Specification:
Chain B: Keywords: Hydrolase, Metal-binding, Signal. The structure is a homodimer. With 755 residues, the first copy, chain A, is an alpha/beta fold. Chain A has two domains: 356 residues, Alpha-Beta Barrel (TIM Barrel), CATH 3.20.20.300; 237 residues, Glycoside hydrolase family 3 C-terminal domain (Rossmann fold, 3-Layer(aba) Sandwich). Chain A is 30% helix and 17% strand. The first copy, chain A, contains 23 helices and 27 strands. In chain A, the strands form eight sheets. In chain A, strands 11-16-15-14-12-13 form a six-stranded mixed beta sheet, sandwiched between helices. In chain A, strands 19-27-26-21-22 form a five-stranded mixed beta sheet. In chain A, strands 17, 18, 20 and 23 form a four-stranded antiparallel beta sheet that branches. In chain A, strand 14, helix 20 and strand 15 form a beta-alpha-beta unit. In chain A, helix 5 runs antiparallel to helix 16. Chain A starts with 12 loop residues before the first helix and ends with a strand. In chain A, 63% of the residues are buried. At the A-B interface, helix 9, strand 7 and strand 8 of A face helix 9, strand 7 and strand 8 of B. Bound molecules: magnesium ion (MG) (5 copies). The site of one magnesium ion has 7 residues of chain B, from loops.
């Protein structure tokens, strides 16, 4: 360690970081803890230094350097900025260049895969890794070596406008997805990142999705055992198994403790229990908000101090409160060892991502990868694996294209592309209307379009031209909608097939920003506005009619589910989604998605997530069907599947043993198809009450007609036990019920005993 | 505690008499004091009961619900006979605790039915609350009951909960103030022994029962330790450590996987060690067994008994309970006898304190004089007059003028029926809205007609006087029949110049969802159920003078009615004299002065909406939806008007341990006398843990003549300005406190002080 040299590429990132940090002044180390927006650094670095003198020593990171630039211009703009940063540091430390990679890179010209919750419907973690390996390549070639993704929050409240960012309600699903995403973006765990990979910052640590009322920023009520067995597991796997380099903290509070000042979470759990060696980044301006919003720090200075000592390493903010850290050290108010501790984490991450050893970006590579043929094909395939068949009464689907003459494609989400939050605007891709038009051209039937109704005012017809940004969204006028509905009814008279494209859009489910009176959470889970009136008016014509749901949050479409026989749930299907919808509507693709959330019947029945305690849904609501509209794991096929009971290899095992379980699944229908075999356990008696069922595995299987297969699962003590308030795994003797089936309701079971 | 202590010495303290007695008792005799089955089988056949349950050879801890279907004198005599059977079996003559329900009066045939608990919370008259429960205790003790499973001091944060009406609202200060007045009314002011004609309280449900997710009865609550210390516990802490509640009952539910009936931290560390409780912990009905059979935490019934007893449950409320295994478990070596002795001694000390050893069992003739006495009926009338809330009075439709009315239509599902709420004797006995208005018309010289309007539940139409069984599960009223009933009321209304709509919910749409079968009582919607809005809009379209009176259990969010009907009274369940109090307020003889003790959200999708949000709790609003409350906490109008000055603190800066005087002037700026509730709130601007944007710390109902001014005085201190950490330690921190005052939680002026 005495001989350690930071210029030695054969040394580990942590040892190069320590050797470099020993050469640095207080001001140089403190500059590494700032991450403003890139825009003002890129446009006038000399003026940025004038306004923010720390920039004489370089910078920790910048956020969103893509700006409005296409792939090659983005790469060149980052190279130019990096040269400005590296020229200011005595040691040539480049900036981290942070972007969003929720479902593809948030940058002009980049491939837009289906939204996270859409992809969660696929139950194909292998394809999730591919999607984010492709995202990483696009990001890194354009100069970004880190991102503020994945969102591995748990969606327990679909009122939340950010639900679409999550992989659903289930800890197992969110955990498996977390690992696939981190390995996709970073590569498999290694001392150094492979080339063409980027650092992840798993967010938001921890409990952000449990905000009361589904209101963004609102406190979460999470007990310590609930924290350990529901909310933390995806983070623990992302950190301790897949090796995520970064982590982002949560806006919110738990029991009065803001996450950005939560030493128990940010230090005791993350550093001591889990051994995290990467960086903790704040969410936007959330260190200041320990004071300005939560009222826990008495000033900006004290907020800076609380966040740093709690364990936040780098502040994502313009003119952040971390700009005060050098003077607070020099004034005696803050121990310099906390500046050094954070800067050493940042530096080791920068070494591990190759910043010191590699070019800044690769403009020509960036141009080849962006929306490449291979990446668009992947986005199409992901959508084909994700779309969920909710119901198909009377086998209306698949449509037979030879028997179609004139199809009406109608609805607020027919002609527009819908990509979800964190997508480059304007949206680029294949709307449902365009997918069906292109399919009709090949198949030889006619397609007619009608608006039907609007969801938000001004969002009608095409989505190709960039809609007025920063303009506040307004609900669509009901009177105009009823005239649009009558127009659609009239146009439908000579159509033999109606395809209604309904749901929500990026204005009715969205992140409610801190500024002003920004809104994005809903107090109702039905289809908003006049869409139900539209669907009823079309369904009354007695035509062959189906619905395709395009939307962000999980929706509870009761009127539609009651009156429309066939419903496809596509969430946001990505830039190739329209082709995938057409292929599924006509049975060229057999739908195979399953719901990664429970769909409750109405918002007054929340919470409805499937892993309730024995008392959680013990009592039902008066005069009201209290069953879910669709249970977790639900999804139909154009074929049928028969299941045998789960078979354990032994009837009894020791507290530390593993156990093999097998399930026989057979295609009992007419068409090749995929089903998702799902494995659940119940810990019958426990030292703390446990859910009535908890998913511990799943497996999507392709089966030809009449084909039968034995699907194998392996469970261990990490599956049969639970973690206590301190994170220690308890395995206790007694009965475990083991359940398997095609969803969380149609289960068969066997029982084993732990001894 | 001395060796000379003698359990027969009435000059000794209850605790010392209980120790002296316990030293004389066997394991089996002490264990028998830990059982509390339902009274009926003990009373009907005591020899058969002892045959079925051998511990009864040594007496019994308690019985539950001995009133049965008997009136006051027969009640008192039936308990005397049963107590003689009990006392004759105990080697030492230990009588039974006789536990009844006293939620809003004694749940027994012929007892005075006061307004429901949430209704009475609207009155902001804790002095009258104390009187109401003094009257209730008299009626209970004279009939042989010396303990009750009351008050319910849960916090109503989720109005979907079918038991909302049993609580005193959402605010910790209000529920704390109410809890102390109830305990001091039922038990008397804290004393070594209960005075005559008082009974023991068992404050329930410990702790967090109201926070069950989904508003679903029995469902887990998610409560952090600081929230628990500053929201849920303060009423229990005040009841236990200040008012001296002798008993306490635990909760059905779990927090973070820990059943409350097995929560050693709650039942021992906080209740025994931190607070110094010396009374008894009684289980809720069969909840010790359910540690095993519902929660899945105990591996067996024997393990459940052990968990409950060691956690700190002293007496099991159950038939054929798991505590019947306690003697054999001690003898088998699976349980230390000292836990049986710890529990039985608490029970015995409570019995001494309640005078069971030194008093007659009951008093049949006094029981007959007290039951629904003229003084108690008048108190029930006056309480309703103080509780009914004027929600809105657009254009000053109220008060009606009696001399100006000719023909009034009284219409709606809650007009002709009496509604008293859960935990009331059936069939209900009282003055319905219709009857109250008919009697007012007779004296006033105008006509009244009645129409059903619509039904809420099928078979519940017309008056509520003749008895029907509770074994017919309730079904919702038929919409087509209701539409015909709406048309009929429309026709009847054509000749009426005034329409009074009696709407809301009933004891079937808000009720306790019981354990057995598929019992239901919680709602996933807060609007008026069924066709009541249809009925209301049909009558409003006629253009006559129309007012609405709301009669219901849970807080309701009647958006349609709030938008379309200009004058709304909220009566909750106004007790057995409620019909008269409603009529008196409709015509101006009483100026309404109730205030809401909960926040009323616009719709169930905006829950939670309780006012004391953290700064982030309602930081963001719902897309395309008015996210303000429909009515804020503390809201209530008047037939006069009140002008408020700003709160004035006596000092701008005080020390951490100082008390502070604050005054608020209020002036009657209208033309008739009336009451208002002056309300004080604080905000701790900066705190080591984030605190609510405002927290009620005082209130005072005032009565003012036209033009009269009063300067209301409040005093605040460390317990008001600070907050309790996760261990219960009061933290007071230097820095700014905002002090706010006004007639409700939204119409406030403020001043700022500094703690140094
Ligand atoms: Mg929506
Ligand atoms: Mg077990
Ligand atoms: Mg607890
Ligand atoms: Mg109701
Ligand atoms: Mg303070």
């Amino acid at each position: 360690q005495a001989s350690d040299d930071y210029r030695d590429r054969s040394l580990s990132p942590a040892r190069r970081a320590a050797a470099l940090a020993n050469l640095m002044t207080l001001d140089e180390m403190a500059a590494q803890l700032n991450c403003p927006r890139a825009a003002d650094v890129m446009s006038d670095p000399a003026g940025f230094e004038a306004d923010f003198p720390y920039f004489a020593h370089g910078i920790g990171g910048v956020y969103s350097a893509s700006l409005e630039a296409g792939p090659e211009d983005n790469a060149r703009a980052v190279m130019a900025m990096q040269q400005e940063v590296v020229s200011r540091s005595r040691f040539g430390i480049p900036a981290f260049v942070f972007e969003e990679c929720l479902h593809g890179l948030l940058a002009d010209g980049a491939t837009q895969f289906p939204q996270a919750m859409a992809m969660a419907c696929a139950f194909r973690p292998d394809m999730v890794r591919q999607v984010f390996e492709a995202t990483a390549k696009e990001a890194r070639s354009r100069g970004s070596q880190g991102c503020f993704s994945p969102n591995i929050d748990i969606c327990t409240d679909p009122r939340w406008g950010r639900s679409e960012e999550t992989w659903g309600e289930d800890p197992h699903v969110v955990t498996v997805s977390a690992k696939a995403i981190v390995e996709g973006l970073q590569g498999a765990p290694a001392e150094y990142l492979p080339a063409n990979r980027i650092a992840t910052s798993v967010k938001h640590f921890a409990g952000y999705g449990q905000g009361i009322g589904g209101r963004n920023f609102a406190p979460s009520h999470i007990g310590p055992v609930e924290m350990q067995n529901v909310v933390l597991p995806p983070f623990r796997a992302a950190i301790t198994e897949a090796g995520s380099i970064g982590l982002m903290a949560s806006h919110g509070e738990i029991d009065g403790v803001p996450a950005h000042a939560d030493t128990h979470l940010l230090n005791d759990v993350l550093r001591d229990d889990w051994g995290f060696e990467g960086y903790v980044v704040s969410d936007w301006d959330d260190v200041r908000r320990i004071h300005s919003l939560h009222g826990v720090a008495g000033s900006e200075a004290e907020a800076a101090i609380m966040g740093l000592r709690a364990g936040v390493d780098i502040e994502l903010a313009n003119n952040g409160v971390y700009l005060m850290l050098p003077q607070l050290v020099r004034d005696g108010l803050l121990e310099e060892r906390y500046v050094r501790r954070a800067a050493e984490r940042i530096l080791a991450a920068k070494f591990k991502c190759g910043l010191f050893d590699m070019p800044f970006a690769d403009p020509a590579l960036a141009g080849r990868l962006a929306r490449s043929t291979e990446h668009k094909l992947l986005a199409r395939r992901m959508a084909e694996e994700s779309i969920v068949l909710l119901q198909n009464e009377g086998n209306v689907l698949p449509l037979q294209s030879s028997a179609v003459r004139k199809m009406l494609v109608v609805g607020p989400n027919a002609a527009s592309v819908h990509l979800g939050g964190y997508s480059p605007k304007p949206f680029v891709g294949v709307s449902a209307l365009e997918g069906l038009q292109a399919y009709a051209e090949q198949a030889g039937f006619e397609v007619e379009y009608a608006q039907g109704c609007a969801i938000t005012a001004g969002d009608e017809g095409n989505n190709e031209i960039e809609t007025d940004a920063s303009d506040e969204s307004v609900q669509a006028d009901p009177a105009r909608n009823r005239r649009l509905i009558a127009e659609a009814v009239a146009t439908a008279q000579d159509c033999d097939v109606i395809v209604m494209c309904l749901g929500g859009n990026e204005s009715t489910a969205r992140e409610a920003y801190f500024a002003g009176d920004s809104r994005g959470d809903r107090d109702d889970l039905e289809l908003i506005g006049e869409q139900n009136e539209l669907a009823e008016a079309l369904l009354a014509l007695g035509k062959t009619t189906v619905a395709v749901l395009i939307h962000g949050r999980p929706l509870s479409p009761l009127v539609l589910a009651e009156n429309c026989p066939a419903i496809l749930d596509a969430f946001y299907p990505g830039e190739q989604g329209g082709h995938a919808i057409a292929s599924i509507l006509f049975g060229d693709v057999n739908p195979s998605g399953k719901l990664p959330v429970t769909i409750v019947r109405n918002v007054g029945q929340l919470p409805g997530y499937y892993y309730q305690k024995p008392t959680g849904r013990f009592r039902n609501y008066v005069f009201s069907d209290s069953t879910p509209l669709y249970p977790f794991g639900h999804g139909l096929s154009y074929t049928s599947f028969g299941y045998g009971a789960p078979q354990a290899e032994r009837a009894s095992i020791g507290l530390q043993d593993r156990l093999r379980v097998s399930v026989s699944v057979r295609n009992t229908g007419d068409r090749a198809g995929q089903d998702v075999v799902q494995l659940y356990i119940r810990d019958s008696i426990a030292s703390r009450a446990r859910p009535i069922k908890e998913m511990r595995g799943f497996q999507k299987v392709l089966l030809e007609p009449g084909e039968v297969q034995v699907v194998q699962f392996e469970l261990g003590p990490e599956d049969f036990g639970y973690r206590d308030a301190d994170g220690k795994l308890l395995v206790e003797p007694g009965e475990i019920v083991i359940m398997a089936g095609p969803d969380s309701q149609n289960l068969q079971e066997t029982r084993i005993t732990l001894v």
